[PDB]
Structure 1
């Protein structure tokens, strides 16, 4: 160990281990991280402009207020390393092998290191027309590393805004600066004014008297690393429940016993429903025995006031509703039906876009998941269910009610390969949430890590001189991050006679994408992660 010895090797690959029903996935990952001298060396607390596209006038009468970026934050001078994403860990072929051969999968445990620290200082030379730059490495400079295993810091580490290590192994990764929210009141009234067509800002402010500011320095112990030094996090063990890798097509009309039918005679005929049968029903039902009114033990899916905007303290937010496909109600392709709690992923060059300085999009609409599909407008309710058919009164078509209840069974989205976050923080409240709208894994104990790195400052000869001067020496670092997280799957075996339709690239896509270009530009394919049909019950 010393200046001239490399501290750790590069390993990025995954290998699978099959024994019996168990399959162990050990996915290594390694990244080359480029770190810049922190912008300012101090903690800052400030709020922001309202945002882009927020209305200045009432012409659209408050509907634009759904575009609100206003927030108040504290930005630390620390940079966040998180490996929370699928595709940081696995390339497309190895996620395919996972998704075909595994029925469900868990997180086993995580381990990660930092090493091969290199710190350089740029030195300008010349008159500025020549402007010769020189890159000298400072052997005694420090890089300082904070990891909170106690989760004392605000968590704020997930892929929303996609701050994560790059997906393809051989490109350099660039960190984003750590920051978290402080309490503020953004409340907006969209009912304001006569006729209730006006929107108004009720109270928009940063609340100071109740506020909590936690620096990295007082919270956790910080390791200081020279060039020959390395850092290891130690083991982190998950405890979470598995996620299903198969999608459910059954609604409550597909689930139960089948309506009595006599078979068709020849290839042209249709099945024929038996008129008089002895089964259970709901209301007074006798003459009209029908599979719609068959009593069932459970119901699959629930209605929601789809795209509910919350308008809580802190701003307008959105309350997801259940994921499902609009494909049954899809009809014409031109129009795009978002109502299935669909999600859209913007992404950049390092995150799997082919073109630099442009951002490709995806928008998963969850087409495979059906039978959970409930579009709120389509539903109805009646006063009475009887052998008689109600009148125009007693029948209500467009309520938009929340029908979630004790009888409902639903599915989470599952893992969304390239851009989806792996895990999440469990909010500590009475009645923890039942399931997550995005991240497939909930951490019952604290989530892993939240590793923070800052480049210690290099000050010039004179300190706090100010006077239109710069305080410290321009510096940057490059170091190598390596980690492995282990997965436990359960072997998938054929449950059907006919051929399955196996995982692969999305339907509209060709294979010339997803492969390197003449320049080396390529896109990573979306993989559903809930990839195959399975009987719900």
Structure 2
């Protein structure tokens, strides 16, 4: 190109192609990215404060230790571009088209580019209120671009902390610095002290002798780009497995053969369960034949120590448990039952909040997903199962056992449209996780490479080793990210006689939200991604 030729165009429109039972979705996305000169040109390793609302005393007996943010990390001068959110890609009407017409979807491949690089230096004349800023584009300045296609850098592209390209095509995007954890010990003893009601710090430190420090420079090759230059990543092919776009309402009581019933006679009458019937029960039960004790081949859902806080080497964390809905147990609407492994997105103006300077939030309670719902305290167990009822003993109620086992069938959450991550890195361990607690797609052979960008340091006349920022000219860049990810769906067709409830906005919400304001402010709606019902087995 040159100084005066643009190196790319803008395509943010998505494509649907229906042939047979297959549906190809080509999602185009384009962003205008504002980049600033790095705060420091150096890599920094440091630990942090314990975080806000962490206990300084034992008044709460240490139940507040779940508010630990403590950690250690390497501060990279680079910046991360991840398009790892749904909604960086599709608009609300495009995701509605996806989930109405597709029963499941996969990731096919990903492309992305960077072009129309503009680097400006900001100069100031005069002083005081007479100070005048001038923005001069530096035509010979460089932008540094690193993509690790070999996945040799630590992966932090999880959309957690919602650091991702924004969801609204016409607004500018602003990157966050690339940073990763180093080895540290944070171990908190909540059993400490007499009566074992006190919490105590055991070890909180950076672990230096075991630590790993990998810079971007010695790891991946870096492209240096002027104004007339562009960058393409090349094709990336996913290998994942499809995600279900439907939700399952069947429990193990909704599942198999139906208990023999005598039909009702008139419009007010109910069916009657037949008393003497033949079939397979579990224990010695031969007379009750309760549909409850009917033997089945599998079991849908499992119990857990809901809100399991694992106090590990790095600190307390949550061990999630299975997703489901508390709607069958809900009763009072005011009380909010979080126990279905619910999640909550806290988001901002670029990520689909209408208000600048304040953040909005969405608690996904997973209401459509029932039949998987297992509240651990509601369960029980008996010593024996037979024609006799056990006594006060022989019967236990509130336990909180993990009942995951070889016979259980569960679901995952699925796509969570605006704020949910798309793919995920697979942990490199002897036993790889069977499924993911958040991201619908697990990458079997390496996640899409991380695109890291940096402005090359632009130095003044004098260069002093003692100097940091006083030594470089104040600089910023704006450029354009474009990307294309392609999806493969499977055509959804009616499986029932009656009308479906088709995808749409969340229940209590209206449509004046989600539409631009007099100032241009609007939100993106939550789209479940498991949308319409389907049979399990």
What TM bracket, shorter-length normalisation? over 0.9
Helix, strand or coil for the counterpart of 1:93?
A: helix
State how far apart, in whole Å, the 1-side matches of 2:149 and 2:458 are: 29
Tell me: CA distance 1:467–1:144, structure 2 relative to 1, closer, same or farther (3 Å). closer
Rounded to whole Å, the distance in 2 between the matches of 1:468 and 1:209 is 28
Cα distance change on mapping 1:202 and 1:403 into 2, 3 Å: same
Corresponding residue for residue 310 of structure 1: 310
How many angstroms does 1:129 deviate by?
2.4
Aligned to 2:128: 128
CA distance in 2, matches of 1:252, 1:280: 15
Report how far residue 465 of structure 1 moved. Answer: 6.0
Cα gap change, 1:367/1:469 in structure 2, threshold over 3 Å: closer, same or farther?
Answer: closer
Q: Per-residue deviation at 1:380?
A: 0.1
SS across alignment from 1:94: helix
Which aligned pairs between 1:25-174 and structure 2 lie closer than 5 A?
Answer: 25-174=25-174
Which residues of structure 2 form unaligned runs of 5+?
none
* Deviation of 1:449 (Å): 1.6
How far apart, CA to CA, are the structure 2 residues paired with 1:143 and 1:379?
A: 59
Would you say how many aligned residue pairs link Structure 1 and Structure 2?
537
Question: Is the contact between residue 347 and residue 353 of structure 2 (CA under 8 Å) also seen in structure 1?
Answer: yes
* Aligned position for 1:404: 404
- Secondary structure of the 2:378 match is coil
Give the conservation status (yes or no) of the 8 Å contact 2:13–2:28. Answer: yes
Alignment map for 1:469-508 (pairs within 5 Å): 470-508=470-508
Secondary structure in structure 2 of the residue aligned to 1:384? coil
More strand by share: 2
Going from structure 1 to structure 2, the CA distance change for 1:460 and 1:8 (only over 3 Å counts) comes to: same
SS in 1 for 2:139: coil
- State the shift of 1:431 in Å: 1.1
After TM superposition, give the deviation of residue 468 of structure 1 in Å: 9.5
CA-to-aligned-CA distance 1:386-407 (integer Å, 9 cap, x gap): 0000000000000110000000
The yes-or-no answer on 1:19 pairing with 2:19 is: yes
Distance 2:286 2:94 in 1: 56
Structure 1 residues 149-196: Cα deviation after superposition (integer angstroms, max 9, x where no partner)? 000000011110000000000000000000000010000000000000
Q: Pairwise CA RMSD of aligned residues?
A: 0.8
- Give 1:190's aligned residue: 190
- CA gap of 1:349–1:277, structure 2 versus 1, over 3 A, is same
Output one character per residue of 1:243-265: Cα deviation in whole Å (capped at 9) or x when no partner. 00000000000001000001000
Counterpart in the other structure of 2:260: 260
Using the size of structure 1 for normalisation, the TM-score is 0.99
CA distance in 2 between counterparts of 1:92 and 1:362 reads 16
Alpha-carbon distance in 2 for matches of 1:466, 1:246: 60
Q: 1:464 deviation in Å?
A: 1.1
Change in Cα spacing, 1:497 to 1:469, as seen in structure 2 (3 Å) is closer
Q: Which residue in the other structure is 1:180 paired with?
A: 180
Structure 1 unaligned residues grouped into runs of 5+: none
Cα offset for 1:128?
A: 2.4
Deviation string, structure 1 residues 177-217 (Cα, Å, up to 9, x no partner)? 00000010000000000000110000110000100000000
Partner Cα separation in structure 1 for residue 109 and residue 468 of structure 2: 50
Q: Secondary structure at the match of 1:98?
A: helix
8 Å CA contact 2:40–2:469 kept in 1: the answer is no
CA shift in 2, pair 1:218/1:468, >3 Å:
closer
Inter-CA distance 376–469: structure 2 relative to 1 (3 Å threshold): closer
Match of 1:424 in 2: 424
